[PDB]
Design a protein around this ligand. Sequence first.
Ligand SMILES: Nc1ncnc2c1ncn2[C@@H]1O[C@H](COP(=O)(O)OP(=O)(O)OP(=O)(O)O)[C@@H](O)[C@H]1O
Ligand SMILES: [Mg+2]
Lengths: 296, 251
Amino acid sequence: SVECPFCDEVSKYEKLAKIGQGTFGEVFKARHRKTGQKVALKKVLMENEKEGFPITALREIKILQLLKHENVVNLIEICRTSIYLVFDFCEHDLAGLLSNVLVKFTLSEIKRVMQMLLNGLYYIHRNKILHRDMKAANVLITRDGVLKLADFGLARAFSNRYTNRVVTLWYRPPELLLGERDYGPPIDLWGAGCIMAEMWTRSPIMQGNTEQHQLALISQLCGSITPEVWPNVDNYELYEKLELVVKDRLKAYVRDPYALDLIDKLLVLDPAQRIDSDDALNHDFFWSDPMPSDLK
Amino acid sequence: NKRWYFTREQLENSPSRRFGVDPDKELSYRQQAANLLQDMGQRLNVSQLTINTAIVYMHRFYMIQSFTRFPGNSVAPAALFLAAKVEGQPKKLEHVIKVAHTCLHPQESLPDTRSEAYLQQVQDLVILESIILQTLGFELTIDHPHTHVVKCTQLVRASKDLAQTSYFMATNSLHLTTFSLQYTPPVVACVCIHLACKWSNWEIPVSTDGKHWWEYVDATVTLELLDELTHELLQILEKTPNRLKRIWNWR
Ligand SMILES: Nc1ncnc2c1ncn2[C@@H]1O[C@H](COP(=O)(O)OP(=O)(O)OP(=O)(O)O)[C@@H](O)[C@H]1O
Ligand SMILES: [Mg+2]
């Protein structure tokens, strides 16, 4: 047997339940054998993998080790025996809570959520990382009411020939559907737009089936994609496939004008006119009554 | 935090020392691994940054494991294989095996990719990558002196020549010394730039404030440590055949 000072055996933790399925293995809830601290064990398995340890897993591990912030999932350590990513345990998730007709948010609370969300984005972009998988199912909340950005399995660093088929279809921004590959932080902010609208509607606002269907559903919410709306949107190649020619559609569900104004600035077609996490945190929404409040 | 930094005494009591390996012998095993890394790396067409990263893996790896148990010729390929995935220039396992083999055995020829012998050595590498990740505690993000050299050398407008020589010293510090186990990268950078200046007979002028060039690179750096360190690096440079020739002024 070979010395291993810095990689502890996962027996350290006591397993309590499967709680999900991963890309390389099962995910468990579990408990520190000594202190009872609750953690999520997310296994990584090397059998179907032909190039040794998955490059894609290494990237996630690299990214998680770098991002240390109140509003981003915390990778505690890696454990052996196979390999497990050990996370701080997070009881709920935005998607599940939104699905639950039993659970109800005040305006004061929804604001706080959007705040922690936008603050996690401010942080990860400031550290040159794109999330790329923005969706309600990837926003976690702990028992103490703290929102964590989670699941960085699609995340990558940045500084211009980046991959295209990223972000689940419903949350994917116009520019990616239009074939863009020089995108930045704004794709995550579009996602924060759909997640925010989702906070009232309780239902993903733009549910597509194909890329041309989503890109159309988008137009029938944000207006047609025209160079008057999006300076130089012509240059894009795929712009010759299915043409066509927002506050009123959400007017019903939301009601609050500020909430509505911000969601309009988040769901903007031109990625360079879409609001950033910085200006959004400053937007009146977070600074007018009722102020943002903690979670119960 | 100061986990991968070691004292001169911890460097003496290395895992290799337990199993009988002389101090001087160990320094060589490190240099030969470094060499094999650079050879494999140029053939595989990866960057110096990848090679550097693999070299630091090697260095750390043998502060925990022993050369008597894991031979540099086995560990170097796997380390480079990892480093290339981590640095975004992934090379295929079959590919690293083929190149590792030609470097170690220029004459022999690769076994049949169908055989039980080749199928084995592919698994040995895959197993060794796993042993490396665990030894390093999955800490794969490595900071190199170079980043910081290239910062300073511009903010003192060094000649293109002086800058190249600094990069040179930086890389050669990874092959020839154990500085990366003892001194932070910005300090190693100062050592590299200091020696490069002494060697090119170039004097960097005391900035307007009164501070020396280095104080703009690391608050801990003293000229006493800079002189001590350049002397060490210079000495091993002189023992290394043909190296200094590369930066020597023949004119
Ligand atoms: N730190 C954590 N605390 C609590 N639950 C977690 C944690 N991490 C993951 N989970 C749960 O694990 C499940 C799936 O995890 P994960 O996102 O890694 O796999 P996935 O389904 O492939 O995700 P995606 O499809 O977004 O890539 C989710 O239902 C989530 O609630
Ligand atoms: Mg998920």
